[PDB]
């Protein structure tokens, strides 16, 4: 007994502030019922805290840092490209090869060049934001009611802008409880109340998708993976609060396999990586997990929870950072490469990560233990974050963010190209030819997504 379909309900930028996680600030009945009849994961940690890093990792099955996909965003311009290795199979291509129809409605946002028709064969792509391909809308639930499919639906999550729907409650910014030692201003309180409203919008959209499956008798045989690509990125001065940036909601539901999925627990507290989502998707559908994928089937009998979960943060827009985190059952550890410098937090007693324990003698052994888990991971994956981005990749940042990039990478680039700082890179550098094993489609939007230069930023 395997499900017929896989469906990822893929939310942008959302923390699990919903009834199923015990939070009754707003009413989330669809999510609560959905969680009650499925498997809820309370320790699912994505490999990255930002869009294109997480989304590239889950679609390739590996840490975004292993294949040079770690920088948000990257490989978008005509003159700067990353290609997956020859022979490589993304998760959708694995499903296509096994006979399924595949789609992703909404943004891809991956940090490599690709022929989308090899990944998603049930619909066409179109130009998206900042070099991304997007998947066109279509009546997937009707068209594929009798064709086994791996689909994704991208929902706006915390980035929903429109709250005029008569089902969105009032949320008073003055009633919001902020994290400890977090900036308490009208703007942060407004961001909190807005994020609660987006929980209701997510709850509504979940209800609509479940109805659409039900109206085409697709609800029983579809394994649904319900998750966000990261939580809200929160800053206390310069300190990123990683725990609730990488820990995301995850509910897995397969109605006709309920008892099989719940066998290890209807509420899973063991440590899960977001990279286990594609691997579990493959296993549930009866597709081998490639040996080079990092994920595991979280429902297999041999799966007893990860000892630790690794996350990575690299460049974000025009901020050239590099940090690596080891999450164990009790601690989050951070290695910060651009303050060498280390952080360690006991989450049980310090959930907002205020008390760095790295320099306390009592915690030296736990510190070294987390550090060594990280060194093992760097040695195993050859973390491409250790290597600097190229001239062409820096030029791509300049095309998109212009004067906003004040990093020493960007200034040094300007000092070396004073003749062309504001000339679009596609007029400075030759286009990158796609490799023999993957010719560039002639589809017109493939050239439109490469027009990344933004005059308004210089």
Taking the alpha carbons of 259, 265, 268, 271 in that order, is the dihedral positive or negative? negative
Phi, psi of 387 (to 5 degrees): -110, 145
Q: Which stretch binds a copy of itself (CB under 8 A): 87-95, 151-159, 168-176, 203-211?
A: 87-95
CA distance 419 to 404: 19
Q: Is 375 in the site for a copy of itself (CB under 8 A)?
A: yes
Q: Is 187 in the site for a copy of itself (CB under 8 A)?
A: no
Q: Is 244 in the site for Ca ion (CB under 5 A)?
A: no
Cα pseudo-dihedral 358, 364, 365, 370, rounded to 10: 20
- The pattern of x and - marking residues 205 through 234 that bind Ca ion according to CB under 5 A reads ------------------------x-----
- The pattern of x and - marking residues 77 through 116 that bind Cl ion according to CB under 5 A reads ----------------------------------------
Residue selected from 13, 343, 366, 383 as contacting Ca ion according to rule CB under 5 A: 13
SS3 299: coil
- Tell me how many helices (H) and strands (E) the chain has: 13, 17
**CA angle at 352 for the pair 232 and 194, rounded to the nearest 5°:** 35
Q: How far is the CB of 230 from a copy of itself (least distance, A)?
A: 25
CA distance 14 to 195: 8
CA distance 443 to 439: 12
136's contact among a copy of itself, Cl ion, Ca ion, none, with CB below 5 to 8 A by partner kind, is Cl ion
Instruction: Check whether the bond before 73 is cis (ω within 30° of 0).
Output: yes
- Report the length, in residues, of the chain: 458
- The pattern of x and - marking residues 150 through 189 that bind Cl ion according to CB under 5 A reads ---------------------------x------------
Q: Identify which of residues 228 and 281 has a Cβ nearer to Ca ion in the complex.
A: 228
Cβ neighbours around 139 below 10 Å, total: 10
Residues facing 250 on adjacent strands: 41, 227
- Binding-site size for a copy of itself (CB under 8 A) equals 24
Residue selected from 11, 20, 26, 51 as contacting Ca ion according to rule CB under 5 A: 51
Q: Is 415 in the site for a copy of itself (CB under 8 A)?
A: no
Q: Identify which of residues 177 and 430 has a Cβ nearer to a copy of itself in the complex.
A: 430
H helix runs in 247-335, sequence order? 258-262, 276-284
324's contact among Cl ion, Ca ion, a copy of itself, none, with CB below 5 to 8 A by partner kind, is none
CA distance 76 to 400: 10
> Which residues of the shown chain bind Ca ion in the complex (CB under 5 A)?
12-13, 51, 229
Q: Which residues bind a copy of itself (CB under 8 A)?
A: 66-67, 85-89, 290-292, 340, 372, 374-383, 386, 436
Interaction site with Cl ion (CB under 5 A): 136-137, 177, 300, 454-456
């Amino acid at each position: 007994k395997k499900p017929t379909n896989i469906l990822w309900i893929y939310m942008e930028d959302q923390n699990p502030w919903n009834n199923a996680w015990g939070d009754y600030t707003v009413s989330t009945p669809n999510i609560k019922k959905f969680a009650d009849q499925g498997v809820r994961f309370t320790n699912a940690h994505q490999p990255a805290p930002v869009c294109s890093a997480t989304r590239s990792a889950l679609i390739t099955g590996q840490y975004q840092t292993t294949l040079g996909l770690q920088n948000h965003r990257s490989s978008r311009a005509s003159y700067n490209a990353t290609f997956l290795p020859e022979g490589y199979k993304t998760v959708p291509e694995l499903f296509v090869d096994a006979g399924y129809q595949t789609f992703n409605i909404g943004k891809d946002d991956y940090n490599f060049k690709y022929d989308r028709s090899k990944l998603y064969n049930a619909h066409e792509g179109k130009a998206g934001f900042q070099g991304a391909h997007d998947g066109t809308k279509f009546d997937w639930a009707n068209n594929l009611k009798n064709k086994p499919f791996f689909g994704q639906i991208q929902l706006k999550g915390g980035k929903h802008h429109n709250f005029n729907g008569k089902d969105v409650p009032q949320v008073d910014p003055d009633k919001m409880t902020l994290p400890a030692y977090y900036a308490d201003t009208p703007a942060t309180r407004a961001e909190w109340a807005k994020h609660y409203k987006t929980q209701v919008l997510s709850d509504i959209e979940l209800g609509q998708i479940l109805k659409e499956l039900d109206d085409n008798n697709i609800l029983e045989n579809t394994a649904i993976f319900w998750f966000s690509d990261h939580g809200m990125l929160l800053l206390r001065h310069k300190q990123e609060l990683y725990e609730d940036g990488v820990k995301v909601p995850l509910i897995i539901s397969w109605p006709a396999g309920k008892e099989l999925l719940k066998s290890k627990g209807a509420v899973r507290n063991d440590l899960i990586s977001g990279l286990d989502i594609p691997a579990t998707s493959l296993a549930l559908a009866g597709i081998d997990i490639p040996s080079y994928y990092d994920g595991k089937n979280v429902f297999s009998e041999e799966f007893s929870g990860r000892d630790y979960v690794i996350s990575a943060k690299d460049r974000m827009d025009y901020t050239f950072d590099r940090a690596r985190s080891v999450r164990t059952e009790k601690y989050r550890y951070i290695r910060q490469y651009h303050p060498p410098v280390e952080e360690l937090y006991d989450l049980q007693s310090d959930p907002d990560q205020i008390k760095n324990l790295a320099a306390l003698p009592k915690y030296k052994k736990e510190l070294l233990r987390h550090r060594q888990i990280l060194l093992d991971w760097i040695a195993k994956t050859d973390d491409k974050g250790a290597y600097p981005e190229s001239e062409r990749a820096v030029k791509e940042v300049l095309d998109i963010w212009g004067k906003n990039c004040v990093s020493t990478q960007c200034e040094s680039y300007r000092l070396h190209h004073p003749d062309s700082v504001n000339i679009p890179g596609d007029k400075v550098y030759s286009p990158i030819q796609w490799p023999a094993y993957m010719p560039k489609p002639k589809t017109p939007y493939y050239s439109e997504i490469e027009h990344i230069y933004r005059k308004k930023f210089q």
